[PDB]
UniProtKB/TrEMBL annotation, chain C:
Protein name listed in UniProt: ADP-ribosyltransferase binding component
Binding site for Ca(2+) 2: 6, 8, 15, 44, 47, 57
Protein species of origin: Clostridioides difficile
Binding site for Ca(2+) 1: 4, 6, 8, 10, 12, 15
From TrEMBL, chain D:
Taxonomic path: Bacteria, Bacillati, Bacillota, Clostridia, Peptostreptococcales
Species name: Clostridioides difficile (Peptoclostridium difficile)
List of residues binding Ca(2+) 2: 6, 8, 15, 44
Range within the parent protein: 217 to 261 of 876
Protein name: ADP-ribosyltransferase binding component
Entry binding sites for Ca(2+) 1: 4, 6, 8, 10, 12, 15
Domain of life the protein comes from: Bacteria
Length: 51, 206, 96, 45, 51
């Protein structure tokens, strides 16, 4: 609480997020359950560059 | 959104993306979008909802600041300066707040009381008839026909085809106010604001 | 000139120029069909769901969906979409 | 010269040299397609 | 005579071809090196209390 008075800042670091994406079934029928984003986070971050 | 007192409605209408050449969605204007969205029927091309007249003149349009910018810039290049002629675009927020009482002096009269001296049998007013007879026009509203602690607005259209003398409008609802309306030879609207109070107050006189 | 690029049972030229549904079949729009009760429809001939809702252009125009959907959501350009909220009717405040 | 090695509906030569989508079909890229609104795409074939 | 020489989830062809998850290290493309994670826990601050 004294570091807070010295002008320091509290940071909210998000370590991970769980979420889904949507896949259309060619007639406009979106589904999201089962399509977990974490299955692609490791694969995208490895062949990419962050801007 | 269409407010239509005693029932509200909210719609989403598809708008073409102009940057994508492969976006083959049909292009619509604001008036066509409103007609498709609320099932409005047009009598003289004037888009009645059920029998409540709905136009940029018969109701009051309310936009957010981003939509009003896109409408103001598109209102220039248009020959017809009608708002209902601007294209529908994505993320464009429109709100239609129909009036509690309304008269076009032609076929729709919703007021519970009457005005003093009308003088219809004209052919002006942006449509149909209009009003005349410099003699004072007033209306008594029993304050049982309004809500207790609301803030209202009073609007209309006025033309003086020879840039002649002024109009003086006074309203007695809560603070008796008076203003000096100077018409033009073309048509404009004024939109004076008042407010009720007192929970069954004296009366309302415009 | 009678293709169906999005496979939603309505041809391309009909979606571009206007159509209506007669006996569960999309027909080219004549201006005499109005005054009989028919509405003129247009949609994206490359999208099967023009408005982006669960229902295709044909299911909407045909009315071939849930019968509790409003009549204006039969237009391929108006989305069938619910706006749900909560409204208060009595407010109770307590000390305990 | 019109193979599809990865079976993603875009041919190899198009993915190598540039393509764009017109009526849901991948077409070879002409430099006049820009200024109309079309973008030039390349991918791993 | 084995379809998975190293005994991992991926066949010899999927490994050699690189036709698997793109977050797998480049050496695990060898049909003889197994694609296999070694996970552990490491301590960064030790806190001892009386209560
Ligand atoms: Ca009139
Ligand atoms: Ca079609
Ligand atoms: Ca379509
Ligand atoms: Ca390919
Ligand atoms: Ca083998």
């Amino acid at each position: 609480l004294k570091k807070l008075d010295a002008g320091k800042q509290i940071k909210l670091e998000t370590t991970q997020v769980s979420g889904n994406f949507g896949t259309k079934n060619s007639s406009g029928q979106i589904v999201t359950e089962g399509n977990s984003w974490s299955d692609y986070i490791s694969q995208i971050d490895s062949i990419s560059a962050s801007i | 959104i269409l407010d239509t007192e005693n029932e509200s409605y909210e719609r989403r209408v598809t708008a073409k993306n102009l940057q994508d050449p492969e976006d083959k969605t049909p292009e619509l204007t604001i008036g066509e979008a409103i007609e498709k969205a609320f099932g409005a029927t047009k009598k003289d091309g004037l888009l009645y909802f059920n029998d409540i007249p709905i136009d940029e003149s018969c109701v009051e349009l309310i936009f957010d600041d981003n939509t009003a910018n896109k409408i103001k810039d598109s209102l220039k290049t248009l020959s017809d300066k009608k708002i209902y002629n601007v294209k529908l675009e994505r993320g464009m927020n429109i709100l239609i707040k129909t009036p509690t009482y309304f008269t076009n002096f032609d076929d729709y009269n919703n007021y519970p009381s009457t005005w003093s001296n009308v003088n219809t049998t004209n052919q002006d007013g942006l449509q149909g008839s209009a009003n005349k007879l410099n003699g004072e026009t007033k209306i008594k509203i029993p304050m049982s026909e309004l809500k207790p602690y609301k803030r209202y607005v009073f609007s209309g259209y006025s033309k003086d085809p020879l840039t002649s003398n002024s109009i003086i409008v006074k309203i007695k609802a809560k603070e008796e106010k008076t203003d000096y309306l100077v018409p033009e030879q073309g048509y404009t609207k004024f939109s004076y604001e008042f407010e009720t109070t007192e929970k069954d107050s004296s009366n309302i006189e415009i | 000139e009678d293709l169906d690029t999005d496979n939603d049972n309505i041809p391309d030229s009909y979606e571009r120029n206007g159509y209506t549904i007669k006996d569960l079949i999309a027909v080219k729009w004549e201006d005499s069909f109005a005054e009989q009760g028919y509405k003129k429809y247009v949609s994206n001939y490359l999208e099967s769901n023009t408005a982006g809702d669960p229902y295709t252009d044909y299911e909407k125009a045909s009315g071939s969906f849930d019968k509790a959907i409003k009549t204006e959501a039969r237009d391929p350009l108006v989305a069938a979409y619910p706006i749900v909220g909560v409204g208060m009717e009595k407010l109770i405040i307590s000390t305990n």
